[PDB]
Amino acid sequence: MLTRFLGPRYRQLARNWVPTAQLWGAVGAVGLVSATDSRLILDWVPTIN
Amino acid sequence: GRQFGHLTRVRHVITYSLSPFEQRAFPHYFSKGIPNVLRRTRACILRVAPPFVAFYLVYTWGTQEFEKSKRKNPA
Amino acid sequence: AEPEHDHRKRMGLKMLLMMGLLLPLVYAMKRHKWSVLKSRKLAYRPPK
Amino acid sequence: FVLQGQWMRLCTSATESEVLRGKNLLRNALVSHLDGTTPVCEDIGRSLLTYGRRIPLAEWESRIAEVDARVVREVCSKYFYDQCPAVAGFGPIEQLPDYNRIRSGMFWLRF
Amino acid sequence: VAPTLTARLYSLLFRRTSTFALTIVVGALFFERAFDQGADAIYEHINEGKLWKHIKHK
Amino acid sequence: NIRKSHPLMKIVNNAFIDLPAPSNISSWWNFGSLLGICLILQILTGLFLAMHYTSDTTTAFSSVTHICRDVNYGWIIRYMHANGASMFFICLYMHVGRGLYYGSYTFLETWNIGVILLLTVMATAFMGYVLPWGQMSFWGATVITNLLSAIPYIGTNLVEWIWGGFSVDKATLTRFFAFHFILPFIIMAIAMVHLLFLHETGSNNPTGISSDVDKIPFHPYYTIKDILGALLLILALMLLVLFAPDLLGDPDNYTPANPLNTPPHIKPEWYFLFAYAILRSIPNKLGGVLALAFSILILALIPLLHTSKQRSMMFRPLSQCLFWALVADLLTLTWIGGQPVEHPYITIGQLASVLYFLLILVLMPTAGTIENKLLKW
Amino acid sequence: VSASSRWLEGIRKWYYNAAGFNKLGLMRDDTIHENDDVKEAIRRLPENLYDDRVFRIKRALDLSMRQQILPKEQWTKYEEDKSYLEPYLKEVIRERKEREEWAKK
Numbered sequence: 001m002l003t004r005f006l007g008p009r010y011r012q013l014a015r016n017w018v019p020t021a022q023l024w025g026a027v028g029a030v031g032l033v034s035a036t037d038s039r040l041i042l043d044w045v046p047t048i049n
Numbered sequence: 050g051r052q053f054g055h056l057t058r059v060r061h062v063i064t065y066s067l068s069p070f071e072q073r074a075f076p077h078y079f080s081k082g083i084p085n086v087l088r089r090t091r092a093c094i095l096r097v098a099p100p101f102v103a104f105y106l107v108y109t110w111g112t113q114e115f116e117k118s119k120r121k122n123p124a
Numbered sequence: 125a126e127p128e129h130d131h132r133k134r135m136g137l138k139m140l141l142m143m144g145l146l147l148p149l150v151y152a153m154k155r156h157k158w159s160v161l162k163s164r165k166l167a168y169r170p171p172k
Numbered sequence: 173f174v175l176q177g178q179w180m181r182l183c184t185s186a187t188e189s190e191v192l193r194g195k196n197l198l199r200n201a202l203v204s205h206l207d208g209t210t211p212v213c214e215d216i217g218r219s220l221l222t223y224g225r226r227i228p229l230a231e232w233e234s235r236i237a238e239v240d241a242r243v244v245r246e247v248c249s250k251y252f253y254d255q256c257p258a259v260a261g262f263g264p265i266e267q268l269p270d271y272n273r274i275r276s277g278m279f280w281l282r283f
Numbered sequence: 284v285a286p287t288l289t290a291r292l293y294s295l296l297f298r299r300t301s302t303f304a305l306t307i308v309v310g311a312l313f314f315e316r317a318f319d320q321g322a323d324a325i326y327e328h329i330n331e332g333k334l335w336k337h338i339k340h341k
Numbered sequence: 342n343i344r345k346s347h348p349l350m351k352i353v354n355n356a357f358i359d360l361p362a363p364s365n366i367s368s369w370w371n372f373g374s375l376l377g378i379c380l381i382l383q384i385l386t387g388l389f390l391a392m393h394y395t396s397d398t399t400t401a402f403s404s405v406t407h408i409c410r411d412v413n414y415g416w417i418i419r420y421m422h423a424n425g426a427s428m429f430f431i432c433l434y435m436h437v438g439r440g441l442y443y444g445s446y447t448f449l450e451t452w453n454i455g456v457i458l459l460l461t462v463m464a465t466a467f468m469g470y471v472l473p474w475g476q477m478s479f480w481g482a483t484v485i486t487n488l489l490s491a492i493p494y495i496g497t498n499l500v501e502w503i504w505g506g507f508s509v510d511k512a513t514l515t516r517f518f519a520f521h522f523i524l525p526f527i528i529m530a531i532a533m534v535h536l537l538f539l540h541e542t543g544s545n546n547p548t549g550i551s552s553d554v555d556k557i558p559f560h561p562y563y564t565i566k567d568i569l570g571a572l573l574l575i576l577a578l579m580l581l582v583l584f585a586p587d588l589l590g591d592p593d594n595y596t597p598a599n600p601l602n603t604p605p606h607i608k609p610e611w612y613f614l615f616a617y618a619i620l621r622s623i624p625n626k627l628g629g630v631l632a633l634a635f636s637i638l639i640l641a642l643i644p645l646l647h648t649s650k651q652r653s654m655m656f657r658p659l660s661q662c663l664f665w666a667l668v669a670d671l672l673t674l675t676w677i678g679g680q681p682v683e684h685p686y687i688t689i690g691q692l693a694s695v696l697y698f699l700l701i702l703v704l705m706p707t708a709g710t711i712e713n714k715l716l717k718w
Numbered sequence: 719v720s721a722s723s724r725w726l727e728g729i730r731k732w733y734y735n736a737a738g739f740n741k742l743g744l745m746r747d748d749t750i751h752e753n754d755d756v757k758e759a760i761r762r763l764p765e766n767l768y769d770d771r772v773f774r775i776k777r778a779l780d781l782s783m784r785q786q787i788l789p790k791e792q793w794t795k796y797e798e799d800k801s802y803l804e805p806y807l808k809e810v811i812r813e814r815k816e817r818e819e820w821a822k823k
């Protein structure tokens with residue numbers, strides 16, 4: 001159906017993009033947190049209240 | 050329209066450039082800079098300045114006559 | 125008449141401090157990219 | 173665009189099979205080139221001027237053998253990733269990209 | 284300071300667009316906390332309607 | 342690759358990325374994006390305003406107060422709209438002026454569409470000001486709308502048709518609201534066509550010479566310079582709205598509407614003051630509105646009176662002076678327009694009006710001819 | 719020839735200097751507005767002048783960008799100002815005018 005993407009190279013591809021994809025998601029996370037403040041998701045560390 | 054590679058025909062003109070990470074964004078900024086603004090001002094005053102002062106004067110005169118008119122001595 | 129008076133002027137203080145910090149920075153961003161063009165040299169070498 | 177596309181791809185996502193192709197292309201280039209008294213002679217003279225030794229094929233083989241994908245994407249990154257290029261153009265170059273754009277293609281926002 | 288702060292800022296945090304993005308967002312947080320308060324604070328050189336000052340009297 | 346081929350990206354690419362642009366454009370070319378910016382800023386704060394405003398006489402003014410006191414941050418939203426309207430006009434005035442000075446008008450279609458864009462925002466803004474239903478909103482709505490009654494045999498009916506009543510009543514406010522909502526979207530489609538015709542030749546530049554010989558891609562260069570440009574727009578706008586919200590509106594338009602009052606004042610907002618001056622300079626109902634109109638549609642005559650062998654004014658001294666006298670004369674006009682029709686003000690307001698038309702219709706083209714002759718052309 | 723002619727010639731030299739295309743090393747014909755008659759004249763130029771015309775426009779746009787100007791010695795001097803386009807332009811006009819006469823009969 002849709003799985004020609006299995007194999008040593010594709011596996012290799014995936015691993016080279018892991019440090020990146022993980023790091024990227026963290027960006028967006030911290031991004032969402034800071035965007036709506038520490039109640040609407042993620043409170044904690046040196047910032048008031 | 051128009052693109053790049055279909056603009057026009059140019060021949061024998063070399064262009065040296067230097068990468069932005071290797072030069073300063075503000076070289077002689079005050080040094081070369083200010084004299085230039087003075088030179089540009091010189092070149093343009095005689096064409097920009099006069100029309101405006103003509104209004105500047107028309108403005109203050111225009112107001113004085115107005116204000117001074119709503120007053121009067123005899124008759 | 126103008127309840128917002130205080131806050132208005134508070135944002136204004138922040139607006140002046142920020143603009144006062146963004147303005148130079150955006151300028152240096154711009155001259156940096158325009159520097160390839162401002163510093164640039166031309167020569168004309170036609171056939172003899 | 174395509175040229176630069178490959179440098180970054182290699183800087184960031186180089187894969188194992190292609191690296192073997194590279195290694196193999198290089199083993200053939202090396203051996204194929206040292207065929208005949210002339211290229212070999214030239215090789216001895218040059219090497220001693222630059223290496224101070226003559227590097228035996230077995231060593232170059234070992235040096236090639238050690239290269240894997242990780243090396244490729246590490247070594248390419250060091251020289252290619254986000255570095256300023258020296259560009260030189262001649263001919264009908266109206267569409268040669270502006271330096272900044274060439275410069276901006278030396279790194280990538282995905283990565 | 285020494286083999287350069289910017290150099291390290293580049294090497295450790297600016298070579299990737301990831302870390303770049305990541306620091307900007309982390310740097311966005313603190314900046315807000317520091318400035319929003321900093322500007323509110325500087326504004327306190329008007330010990331007048333200063334709600335806090337009135338809070339004590341009434 | 343992807344940018345160049347994809348049906349939507351092409352458009353973006355051809356308009357803001359790979360568009361060949363002269364490496365030469367100066368600050369006076371920034372008003373293009375700035376209007377674009379002003380247009381969006383004015384639709385965005387405009388929509389949020391419509392979420393609390395009501396277009397009925399008995400609550401109209403009250404709803405606007407409701408916004409500034411009760412609606413969170415309603416006040417900034419309100420003043421940003423207010424000031425953005427003037428900011429939109431300063432930019433509009435720079436833009437038209439820029440083109441006049443630089444010969445940009447030689448691009449007829451682009452320019453003509455520009456005139457349609459000028460009229461559309463004027464009609465738009467005029468309706469905007471009536472919405473709060475303030476003293477000036479009503480009387481400015483009265484004074485201005487009534488002009489159409491000078492048109493022979495059709496006029497009375499016309500004014501009564503758009504009014505909805507026999508005055509500026511209930512029908513007029515709701516009416517004016519609806520058109521004030523629909524107009525900026527139409528303006529947008531038209532700005533797209535403005536940009537569509539412009540792309541057919543690319544931009545002009547200060548020399549009026551021709552830049553195929555030295556184009557640079559719109560991207561680093563003019564995206565980043567428009568950014569810095571929008572930033573300065575924001576400064577001017579915010580400096581205006583935070584520190585002096587009522588400066589250009591003048592302390593006046595508060596206190597609700599009263600169809601029996603008639604304030605010894607009556608003057609449209611500042612951006613119509615030059616036109617306003619021209620109108621009252623003429624003793625005559627018909628002639629006044631005829632010359633009122635002509636003072637703006639004359640922009641559609643400019644290309645027919647180019648006359649000079651060079652396109653720009655950069656290399657033409659006499660023309661520069663005449664241009665500056667046009668701008669100088671336009672200050673006088675707004676200044677006069679903002680003053681009562683008494684002793685000094687009538688006659689200069691009269692003289693300046695004749696000059697406006699003498700300058701554009703006779704003096705400027707003549708200078709072009711003289712200029713050609715001095716260069717042996 | 720005398721006093722008056724030199725006066726008109728001096729007024730012309732004055733205007734020239736004021737017009738300031740000289741300051742950007744431009745020649746008068748480099749500033750001509752490009753309508754069809756002119757577009758064609760440009761086309762008809764020989765290789766040399768065409769190339770020189772492009773370098774000047776380029777030199778000028780460059781200056782115009784960084785809002786600078788050329789040292790006084792390199793300004794083009796009035797009447798050392800070759801009006802290279804004129805004869806082509808004239809001929810192109812003359813050709814159009816002939817087409818136009820034929821279109822009336």
Ligand code: HEM
Binds near residue numbers: 383385426469
């Ligand atoms: C479709 C987009 C727009 C919407 C939804 C909108 C909405 C509104 C509303 C609800 C009001 C009445 C509330 C108030 O007066 O603050 C208003 C007033 C006004 N509008 Fe707009 N508007 C739009 C576009 C524009 C445009 C493009 C301009 C031209 C610059 C403009 C100029 C004005 C002016 C001058 C006022 C009166 C100023 C004031 O009292 O604050 N509007 N608009």
Ligand code: HEM
Binds near residue numbers: 369433436
């Ligand atoms: C909704 C209002 C308007 C918008 C959004 C708009 C948009 C633009 C934009 C984005 C440009 C790009 C070139 C530049 O940056 O200057 C431009 C150029 C131009 N516009 Fe407008 N414009 C508006 C009103 C006007 C009007 C009032 C005129 C004059 C009647 C006008 C006539 C022109 C002309 C002739 C050019 C060519 C300029 C040149 O190449 O030097 N536009 N306009």
